[PDB]
Amino acid sequence: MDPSQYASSSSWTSFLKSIASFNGDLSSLSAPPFILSPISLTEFSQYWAEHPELFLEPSFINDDNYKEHCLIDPEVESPELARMLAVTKWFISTLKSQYCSRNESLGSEKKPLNPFLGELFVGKWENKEHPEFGETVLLSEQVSHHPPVTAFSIFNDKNKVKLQGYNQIKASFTKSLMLTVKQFGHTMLDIKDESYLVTPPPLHIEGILVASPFVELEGKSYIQSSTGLLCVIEFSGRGYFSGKKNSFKARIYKDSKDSKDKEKALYTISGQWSGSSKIIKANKKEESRLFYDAARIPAEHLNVKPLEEQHPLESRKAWYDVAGAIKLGDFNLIAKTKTELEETQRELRKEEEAKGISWQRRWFKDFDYSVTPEEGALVPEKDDTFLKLASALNLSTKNAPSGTLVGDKEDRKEDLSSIHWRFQRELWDEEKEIVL
Ligand SMILES: CC(C)CCC[C@@](C)(O)[C@H]1CC[C@H]2[C@@H]3CC=C4C[C@@H](O)CC[C@]4(C)[C@H]3CC[C@@]21C
Ligand SMILES: [Pb+2]
């Protein structure tokens, strides 16, 4: 049917009624075929680097050229600060990819495919137009199904720029049908020997009543560097803090201590992350400059090998029949293909439980950061990067919502674990079957 018919359709009415009895498992929502996406969440990891030049820019900034690598401020105080500005621009540039891609390609936000345990999604940005960039690899793996957890790593060996992180969410509906989503997990970006800890923001899904879902960000995201510098990004929508949706305000401070006082902000960036934003240095509000305009820079999608060459664990290969049925809008075929895949998985889980076997993750392992870790789990190292950056930001190391600070209510939750997924480059190095 035409989208204009969605809201009043029998299918949507039945869907809204199913929300009243939502059990907490988003995948249980009786969503109609017209609101289904043929893309698996394991693919979302690619959204961290769809602007190759911004992802790698920090690596080209050094003590001898930094003032030539800061468009908004040729008089930038230091290379560390020039790099923080670059990392911040990169972070902002990821937002349109992360939260607006389906609106563009599908017509609105839609229900993504719930990944199966073990699912993989790999590819690469060849950056053929920029030989100095080199190849950038994406590795994404579903390390958990109950609950859904996706781990990933994007790395550029040539320029020593590497990123790793993981993601999971917890969602609930308000009485007015707003879908509140809390993100969990974090992402770390290494630029040579300099590190950055990034925490995703919470969000809500609007437009459910009118059958035109869309993401709006809220709360805050942090970018803590090993240089001490810290960027605090606050999100808002519609009004309240800006006459336009998808708005944000980012402030860069010398350190976590200074972030307590907005007046100490070295720079203040404001605008829409899905559009244009300006930046002001210090308090010189009369000298704002364009920081980033999402509309001027088209996203660059990674190269994925043809289906014919994909391993059975690769997302698109495994979900092929389901994606095809979804595109066709065949109610019975969607139910059939999805059940076939998910039932086969349930069978595997039941067998493992009965045989005393456990699924082994391929390129990621879960490290127990608890003071009293499980006796068989891997534990972090002395100079663990997450530990030092979290300490600098005074960020909770527990499995609390992304961005939770030490002492916050969420951090004071009793019997809360501290297990985090980590990329093991060695496992990819010795990979014997998967290729790009
Ligand atoms: C019809 C619709 C209400 C079905 C449910 C859709 C959904 C709530 O599952 C979707 C809609 C928006 C999706 C989010 C969009 C963007 C991201 C950023 C990515 O880095 C991690 C996944 C994450 C956080 C998605 C999780 C699943 C979400 C939240
Ligand atoms: Pb384990």
Swiss-Prot record:
Annotated residues for binding of 7beta-hydroxycholesterol: 98, 102
Modification type Phosphothreonine: residues: 372
Modified residues (Phosphoserine): 391
Outcome reported for the amino acid change (mutating residue 114 to E): Abolishes binding to phosphatidylinositol 4-phosphate
Annotated region described as ALPS motif, given as residue ranges: 9-31
Top-rank taxon, per record: Eukaryota
Effect of residue 99 to F: Abolishes both cholesterol binding and biological function
Positions of disulphide bridges: none
Keyword set, alphabetical order: Cytoplasm, Golgi apparatus, Lipid transport, Lipid-binding, Membrane, Phosphoprotein, Transport
Binding site for cholesterol: 98
Subcellular location: Cytoplasm; Golgi apparatus membrane
InterPro entries tied to this protein: OSBP_sf (IPR037239), Oxysterol-bd (IPR000648), Oxysterol-bd_CS (IPR018494)
Effect upon mutating residue 119 to A: Abolishes both cholesterol binding and biological function
Binding site for 20-hydroxycholesterol: 98
Renumbered residue ranges of the record's region OSBP-related domain (ORD): 18-368
Keyword Transmembrane helix annotated: no
Annotated 25-hydroxycholesterol binding sites: 98
A cellular-component GO term for this protein: membrane
Amino acids binding a 1,2-diacyl-sn-glycero-3-phospho-(1D-myo-inositol 4-phosphate): 26-31, 111-114, 145-146, 338, 342, 346
Residues where ergosterol binds: 98
Domain notes: The OSBP-related domain (ORD) mediates binding of sterols and phospholipids. It displays an incomplete beta-barrel containing a central hydrophobic tunnel that can accommodate a single lipid molecule with a flexible lid covering the tunnel entrance. The ORD can bind two membranes simultaneously. It has at least two membrane-binding surfaces; one near the mouth of the lipid-binding pocket and a distal site that can bind a second membrane.
Other known facts: Present with 32200 molecules/cell in log phase SD medium.
Function: Lipid transport protein (LTP) involved in non-vesicular transfer of lipids between membranes. Functions in phosphoinositide-coupled directional transport of various lipids by carrying the lipid molecule in a hydrophobic pocket and transferring it between membranes through the cytosol. Involved in maintenance of intracellular sterol distribution and homeostasis. Involved in lipid countertransport between the Golgi complex and membranes of the endoplasmic reticulum.
Family label: Belongs to the OSBP family.
Protein name (record): Oxysterol-binding protein homolog 4
Species, as recorded: Saccharomyces cerevisiae (strain ATCC 204508 / S288c) (Baker's yeast)
Gene designation per UniProt: KES1
